[PDB]
Ligand binder design. Structure first.
Ligand SMILES: Nc1ncnc2c1ncn2[C@@H]1O[C@H](COP(=O)(O)OP(=O)(O)O)[C@@H](O)[C@H]1O[C@@H]1O[C@H](COP(=O)(O)O)[C@@H](O)[C@H]1O
Lengths: 614, 519
C-alpha cells in the first residue's frame, strides 16, 4: 500500500531510520550495506550556521544552483535555475569532497547494481535530498535503468528547494524517489518558511533545544514558534491566492512589498498522527498542510503546541515503530478528503485551501488533455504535412526554395503557407502561454511526443517566420531577428530538444557550441570570437536564415568569422535534419546567390564548394 | 465550481507586515498630531493623522488649475468630485511640496491614515498615481475607518484608470463613519470589512455600497467604535495561531457555497439570521463569473490566428496596389473604391476591426488578465495590424464622410488609441539603419494628417490675404511639410506614399508650386 505508492517497504523505512540515528555519532555520513541495499545517512547539525549560511546576505539563506553541475534542476524553456538552501548545499559539497570516501563508496555500490538509499533526520534529511539530486545528475540521467533508481527517505527534514526545484524533480520524473516523513507538529519542516530576520534572535536557542544534547525557555520556544507560524501564514495565504489566479492585480501590487520564503515541499510528504499515515504528492497542498496541521483548536492546545512542536521532532522513533498500526491513505487520490484532514487538525477553511491546491493540479491535467487532443487531431498535423509535402517540393521545383518563395512571391501557395504559419503560431503560442503561467503539469516540457512535435514544427516553420520578419522589414524596425524578433515558442522548442538530446551525455548546449567554434580554429582570439558571435544565428540550425540575412549585406572581412562559423555548423545541421540540403543551395536561394559572391579564395577553400556554381 | 476568495484576499492582507506596520504608523501619527514618515523593514510609511475638526460632506470638482493636478482621471462631464475639506487640508498641510522630496529615492511607499487621515492618505495616493508618468516607487494605500472621499464619477474613473487595487480600506463592521457619508459619495478601491471574527474583501463599488446598506440595518451606534482599530488590527493579525472551523451547523457540501458561508461567518453573521442572508447574497453577487482569464488569454492565440488571414488579405491587397500601373498607393486606391479588389479587402478591414474591438472590450471588462496588454505578443500583433490597417480605416472614413469632421478630430476608433498606449509596454529606441522604405508607414495616422494638410492648402488657395496665407503656411502647412520630409528622409514611410499618383505626391507637387509663387 505505502510500498505500492512509494516503491519503499517498512523494512527499508526502519533501516533508513536506524542509519539516520547512526549518523549522529559519525561525522558527515554513515554507510549501511545490507543485502541489495546500500544506505547513506547524513549527520544533522543544530547550529544556526547550518540553516542560514552566515555569509549569505539574502533573506532566506537561499542560492541558485550551479547550472553546469545541476543541468536538469531548472525550467527548460524559461531557463530559470532552481534555488536551494546554501548551508545544506555547502554541507553536501564538503561530503562530496574527494578527500572523503563518499564518492568512492557510491561508485562502488553503483558498480554492484546496488539499490542506493539516501536518508537523514533533521538537516541530514535535507542533506539527503540534495545528495539524491547529485546522484540523479551524476548517474541516473546518464544510464536510466531500474537497478540505478535511488531512494531518499527523510524524517522531520526542513525544506530545501524552491518551486523550480520541485518542478524540475517533476519534469524528470524524479519526484517518485523521495519520501519525507513529518510528525504532525514537528517545527523543523516549518522553520524555513520564515524570514531569517523573524527567527534570528531565538533560533540558536531552539536549535540547541532540538539537539539531543543536554536540555536545561518556554518564552523562547513560544516566541520562535509564533514567529515561524506568522511568516508561514503569510506564505500560505499568498501562495494559495496566487496559484488559483485569484486577485492577480492586488497580489502583484502587494508582492513588491513582501519578502516570502521561496522554499517548497519536494517529493512525497507523509504526515503522521496517532491514528493515520497520510501521503501527499502535490507540493502546494503539502505547503498549506504544513501551516494548517499545526494550528491550535482551543486554548489548552495553544498552551501546549510550541513545546509539543519541539518534542515532536523526536517522535520519528515511535513513528517507524508504529507504522503498521496506523491507517494509511493517499490524499491526492482520495475523492473525499474531509475525514483525513479532520484527523490531521485541518479546519474547514484550511480544507478549502488544501482542496484548492489539489484541484489546481487537476485543472493542469485537464489543460494538458485538451492540448494533447488538439495536437493529435489530423486537421492539425496536416498543416505541418502540407508544408512538408507540398509547399517545399513545389518551391524547390521552382528553383528558389520555400524560404525565398515565402519571402518574395505572392502566389496562392505562398498565401496558404502564410495562413498555416499563423495557425501553427496560434497552437504553439497557446501552449507557451499556459506554461508561462504554470497551467500545465510539471512533466509536459519533458514529454517525448511533444518534444518531437515541437522540433518538427521549429525546423519546418521557423524559416517561414524568419522569412516573414524580413519580408515585412521588421528587422529594420526592431533589429536583427536573433536579438528581439525571434518568437519565444521557438526558443522553448529549441531548449526542450537540446535538453532531450544532451542530458544523457551530461553535456550543455552552450558548451557544445563553443567547443565546436574552438575546433574551427578561426583566426581571432578567444574574447574577440566571443564578441563576434554574440546573438548569432549559428547556435541553432532553424536560425540559419536569420544569420544569412545578417551577413549577406556586408563586406567579407566584416563577417569572415561569422561566415566560417555558419559554414562550420552546416554539415551537422544537414545530417541532423535541422537544415534541408534540397533547399538552401538552389539557384534562387538567397544563401546560394550570396555565397557565390564571396572571394574566390574563400570559396575555393570552403567545405561547401561542391554545392554551388558561380 | 467557482472558488470564493473574499475572505482569502482579506487574510492575505491581514497576514502581511504592511497591515500592522501601517496601523502602528497611523497610531504614532495620531498621538503626535503630525504626519509621520519613516521606514519599517525597508518600506516607507507616510501616515497622516486623524483631523477631527474639518467639516466633511461637501463635494467639489478636482482642481483644473494650480500645481496639484490629476491628468490620469476623467474630464468627461460626469465630472469627478472630492470632499472639499480634504482637498483644502491637502493644500493646507503642504503635502505635495513636501512629500515630493521626502520620497525621492525611496522605492516602496505606503500611504496610510485613520479616519480623515485615511481620507487624506487616499487622496494623496490617488494624486501620486494620477500623473502622466507612474511614480518612481510602488504605491500602496491602506486606510482605517476612512469616510468616503468622492462621488460616483471619481470612483468609476479610478476603476477605469486601473488604480483601484492600490487601495485597501479597512472598515470595522461596527464603525459608523465609513457607512455614514452623504448619499452623493461613492466608495472606490478594495474594502476589507472586518470584525472580531475575521475579514472579507469586496473590490466592487456596488458590492461595497450594498454592504454599507446591510450594515446600516444592524444595531449599536456608540461613536467610540471608530476608535478601536488597534484592537481589530491586533486580533486579526494574531488569528493565525487559532484553528477556525465553521460554527453554524450545515456547511453546504458544495465548495463555492462553503467558502461563501465561511466568509459570512468571518464578518460575524449567522447564515440563519436575516442580516447573514443579505451578507451572503452580497458576497455571492460580488464575483461575476467568467472563464478564467489566464486560460482565456492563452486560447486567444488561436482566435488571433483564425482572424489573421484578413490581415494577410490587406498585405496581398497592398502588394497588388504597389504593382498596379495607376500608382495610387493602396490608401488612395481604397478611398477611390472602384475595383472589386477594394470591396474584397474591405471585408477583411471589417473582420479585423471587430476582432480587435472584442479583444479591447475583454480587456476593459477583465475577461483578460490585468497584465494582458504587457505581453510582447499582443503589443506587436496589434501594432502589425494597426500599421497595415489604420490607413484603410482612415480612407474609409474620408470616403464616406459628408464633407463631416476630420479623422483625428474625435473620429479615430477607440481601439487605435488603446493600441497606441499598448506600444509603451515595450522598448522604443533601436533606431536601425534603414536600407529602403519601411514596409508600412511608421506613423499610422500619416494619411489623416495629410488629408488635413490638403484641406489647409486649399483654404490657402482661397488666400486673398498675403500675410494670412503665411499664417496658414507658417502654422499649419510647412510644419507638416517638414514632418513628412523627415519621415521620407529617415525612410519611415512605405513606398506607396511616394507613388507618382498618390495624394502625397500630388500634394507635394501642389505645395512646391505654391511655394515658388510666394517666396
Ligand atoms: N517588429 C515586429 N513586428 C511585429 N511582430 C513582431 C515584431 N517583432 C517580434 N514580433 C512578434 O512578436 C511576438 C512576440 O511573442 P513572444 O516572443 O512569444 O513574447 P514574449 O512575451 O515571450 O517576449 C513573436 O511572435 C514575434 O514573431 C516574429 O515576428 C513576426 C510576426 O508576424 P505575424 O505572426 O504574422 O504577426 C513573426 O513572423 C516572427 O518572425
Amino acid at each position: 500500500a505505502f510500498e505500492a505508492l512509494t516503491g519503499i517497504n517498512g523494512d527499508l523505512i526502519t533501516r533508513s531510520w536506524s542509519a539516520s540515528k547512526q549518523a549522529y555519532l559519525t561525522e558527515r555520513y554513515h554507510k549501511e550495506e545490507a543485502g541489495a541495499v546500500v544506505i547513506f545517512a547524513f549527520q544533522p547539525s543544530f547550529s544556526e550556521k547550518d540553516f542560514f549560511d552566515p555569509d549569505n546576505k539574502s533573506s532566506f539563506g537561499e542560492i541558485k544552483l550551479n547550472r553546469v553541475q545541476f543541468p536538469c534542476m531548472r525550467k527548460i524553456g524559461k531557463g530559470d535555475v532552481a534555488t536551494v538552501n546554501e548551508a545544506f548545499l555547502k554541507n553536501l559539497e564538503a561530503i562530496i569532497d574527494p578527500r572523503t570516501s563518499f564518492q568512492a563508496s557510491v561508485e562502488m555500490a553503483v558498480r554492484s547494481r546496488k539499490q542506493i538509499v539516501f536518508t537523514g533526520h533533521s538537516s541530514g534529511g535535507a542533506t539527503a535530498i540534495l545528495a539524491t539530486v547529485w546522484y540523479l545528475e551524476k548517474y541516473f540521467i546518464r544510464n536510466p535503468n531500474v537497478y540505478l533508481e535511488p531512494r531518499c527517505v527523510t524524517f522531520g527534514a526542513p525544506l530545501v528547494g524552491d518551486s523550480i526545484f520541485s518542478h524540475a524533480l517533476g519534469r524528470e520524473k524524479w519526484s517518485r524517489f523521495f519520501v519525507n516523513f513529518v510528525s504532525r507538529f514537528d517545527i523543523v519542516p516549518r522553520i524555513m518558511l520564515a524570514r531569517k530576520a523573524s527567527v534570528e534572535e531565538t533560533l540558536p536557542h531552539v536549535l540547541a533545544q532540538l539537539d539531543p544534547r543536554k536540555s536545561s525557555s518556554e518564552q523562547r520556544i513560544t516566541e520562535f514558534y509564533t514567529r515561524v507560524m506568522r511568516d508561514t501564514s503569510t506564505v500560505a495565504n499568498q501562495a494559495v491566492c496566487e496559484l488559483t489566479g485569484s486577485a492577480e492585480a492586488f497580489l502583484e501590487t502587494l508582492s513588491s512589498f513582501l519578502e516570502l520564503s521561496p522554499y517548497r515541499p519536494a517529493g512525497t510528504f507523509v504526515f503522521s498522527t496517532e491514528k493515520r499515515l497520510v501521503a501527499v504528492n502535490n507540493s502546494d497542498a503539502i505547503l498549506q498542510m504544513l501551516f494548517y496541521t499545526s494550528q491550535a483548536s482551543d486554548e489548552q492546545e495553544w498552551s501546549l503546541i510550541p513545546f509539543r512542536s519541539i518534542r515532536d521532532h523526536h517522535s520519528y522513533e515511535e513513528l517507524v515503530q508504529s507504522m503498521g498500526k496506523k491507517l494509511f491513505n493517499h490524499l491526492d487520490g482520495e475523492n473525499s478528503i474531509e475525514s483525513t484532514l479532520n484527523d490531521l487538525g485541518v479546519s474547514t477553511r484550511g480544507r478549502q485551501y488544501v482542496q484548492a491546491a489539489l484541484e489546481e493540479e487537476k485543472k493542469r491535467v485537464e489543460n494538458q488533455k485538451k492540448i494533447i487532443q488538439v495536437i493529435e487531431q489530423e486537421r492539425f498535423l496536416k498543416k505541418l504535412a502540407w508544408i512538408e509535402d507540398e509547399y517545399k517540393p513545389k518551391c524547390q521545383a521552382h528553383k528558389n526554395g520555400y524560404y525565398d518563395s515565402f519571402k518574395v512571391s505572392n502566389e496562392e501557395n505562398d498565401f496558404k503557407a502564410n495562413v498555416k504559419r499563423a495557425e501553427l503560431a496560434g497552437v504553439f503560442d497557446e501552449v507557451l502561454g499556459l506554461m508561462k503561467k504554470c497551467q500545465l503539469p510539471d512533466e509536459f516540457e519533458g514529454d517525448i511526443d511533444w518534444i518531437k512535435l515541437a522540433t518538427r514544427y521549429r525546423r519546418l516553420v521557423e524559416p517561414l517566420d524568419i522569412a516573414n520578419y524580413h519580408r515585412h522589414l521588421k528587422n529594420e524596425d526592431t533589429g536583427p531577428y536573433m536579438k528581439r524578433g525571434r518568437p519565444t515558442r521557438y526558443i522553448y522548442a529549441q531548449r526542450g530538444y537540446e535538453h532531450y538530446i544532451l542530458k544523457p551525455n551530461g553535456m550543455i548546449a552552450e558548451d557544445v557550441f563553443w567547443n565546436k567554434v574552438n575546433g574551427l580554429n578561426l583566426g581571432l582570439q578567444l574574447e574577440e570570437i566571443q564578441e563576434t558571435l554574440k546573438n548569432s544565428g549559428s547556435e541553432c540550425g532553424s536560425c540559419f536564415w536569420a544569420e544569412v540575412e545578417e551577413l549577406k549585406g556586408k563586406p567579407y572581412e566584416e563577417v569572415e568569422v561569422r561566415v566560417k562559423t555558419l559554414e562550420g555548423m552546416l554539415g551537422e545541421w544537414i545530417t541532423d535534419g535541422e537544415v534541408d540540403d534540397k533547399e538552401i543551395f538552389l539557384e534562387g536561394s538567397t544563401f546560394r546567390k550570396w555565397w557565390i559572391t564571396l572571394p574566390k579564395n574563400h570559396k575555393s577553400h570552403s567545405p561547401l564548394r561542391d554545392y554551388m556554381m558561380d | 465550481c467557482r472558488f470564493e476568495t473574499s475572505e482569502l484576499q482579506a487574510s492575505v492582507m491581514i497576514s502581511t507586515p504592511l497591515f500592522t506596520d501601517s496601523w502602528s504608523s497611523c497610531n504614532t501619527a495620531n498621538c503626535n498630531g503630525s504626519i509621520k514618515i519613516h521606514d519599517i523593514a525597508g518600506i516607507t510609511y507616510v501616515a497622516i493623522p486623524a483631523v477631527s475638526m474639518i467639516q466633511l460632506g461637501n463635494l467639489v470638482g478636482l482642481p483644473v488649475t494650480g500645481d496639484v493636478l490629476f491628468p490620469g482621471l476623467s474630464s468627461d462631464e460626469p465630472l469627478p468630485m472630492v470632499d472639499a475639506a480634504i482637498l483644502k487640508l491637502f493644500l493646507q498641510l503642504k503635502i505635495k511640496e513636501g512629500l515630493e522630496l521626502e520620497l525621492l529615492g525611496k522605492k516602496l511607499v505606503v500611504i496610510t491614515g485613520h479616519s480623515t487621515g485615511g481620507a487624506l492618505a487616499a487622496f494623496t495616493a490617488l494624486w501620486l498615481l494620477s500623473q502622466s508618468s507612474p511614480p518612481s516607487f510602488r504605491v500602496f494605500c491602506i486606510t482605517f475607518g476612512s469616510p468616503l472621499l468622492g462621488n460616483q464619477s471619481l470612483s468609476t474613473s479610478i476603476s477605469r484608470s486601473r488604480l483601484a487595487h492600490n487601495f485597501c480600506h479597512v472598515v470595522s463592521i461596527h464603525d459608523l463613519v465609513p457607512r455614514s457619508s452623504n448619499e452623493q459619495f461613492w466608495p472606490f478601491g478594495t474594502y476589507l470589512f472586518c470584525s472580531d471574527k475575521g475579514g472579507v474583501c469586496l473590490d466592487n463599488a456596488g458590492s461595497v455600497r450594498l454592504m454599507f446598506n446591510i450594515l446600516n440595518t444592524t444595531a449599536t451606534q456608540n461613536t467610540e467604535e471608530h476608535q478601536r482599530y488597534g484592537h481589530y488590527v491586533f486580533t486579526l493579525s494574531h488569528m493565525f495561531l487559532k484553528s477556525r472551523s465553521f460554527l453554524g451547523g450545515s456547511i453546504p457540501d458544495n465548495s463555492y457555497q462553503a467558502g461563501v458561508a465561511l466568509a459570512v461567518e468571518a464578518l460575524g453573521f449567522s447564515n440563519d439570521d436575516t442580516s447573514g442572508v443579505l451578507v451572503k447574497e452580497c458576497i455571492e453577487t460580488a464575483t461575476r463569473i467568467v472563464r478564467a482569464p489566464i486560460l482565456r488569454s492563452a486560447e486567444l492565440a488561436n482566435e488571433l490566428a483564425s482572424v489573421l488571414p484578413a490581415r494577410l488579405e490587406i498585405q496581398w491587397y497592398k502588394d497588388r496596389c504597389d504593382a498596379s500601373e495607376e500608382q495610387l498607393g493602396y490608401y488612395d486606391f481604397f478611398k477611390r473604391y472602384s475595383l472589386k479588389r477594394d470591396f474584397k479587402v474591405n471585408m477583411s478591414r471589417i473582420r479585423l476591426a471587430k476582432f480587435w474591438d472584442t479583444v479591447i472590450k475583454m480587456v476593459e471588462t477583465n475577461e483578460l488578465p490585468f497584465d494582458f496588454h504587457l505581453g510582447k505578443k499582443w503589443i506587436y500583433a496589434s501594432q502589425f495590424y494597426q500599421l497595415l490597417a489604420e490607413p484603410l480605416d482612415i480612407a474609409n472614413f474620408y470616403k464616406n464622410r459628408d464633407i463631416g469632421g476630420h479623422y483625428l478630430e474625435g473620429n479615430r476608433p477607440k481601439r487605435y488609441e488603446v493600441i497606441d498606449k499598448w506600444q509603451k509596454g515595450v522598448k522604443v529606441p533601436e533606431e536601425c539603419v534603414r536600407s529602403r522604405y519601411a514596409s508600412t508607414t511608421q506613423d499610422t495616422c500619416f494619411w489623416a494628417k495629410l488629408e488635413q494638410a490638403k484641406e489647409w492648402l486649399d483654404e490657402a488657395r482661397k488666400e486673398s490675404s498675403d500675410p494670412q496665407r503665411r499664417s496658414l503656411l507658417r502654422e499649419k502647412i510647412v510644419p507638416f511639410e517638414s514632418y513628412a520630409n523627415t519621415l521620407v528622409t529617415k525612410k519611415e514611410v512605405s513606398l506607396d506614399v511616394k507613388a507618382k499618383n498618390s495624394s502625397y505626391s500630388v500634394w507635394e507637387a501642389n505645395l512646391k508650386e505654391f511655394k515658388c509663387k510666394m517666396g
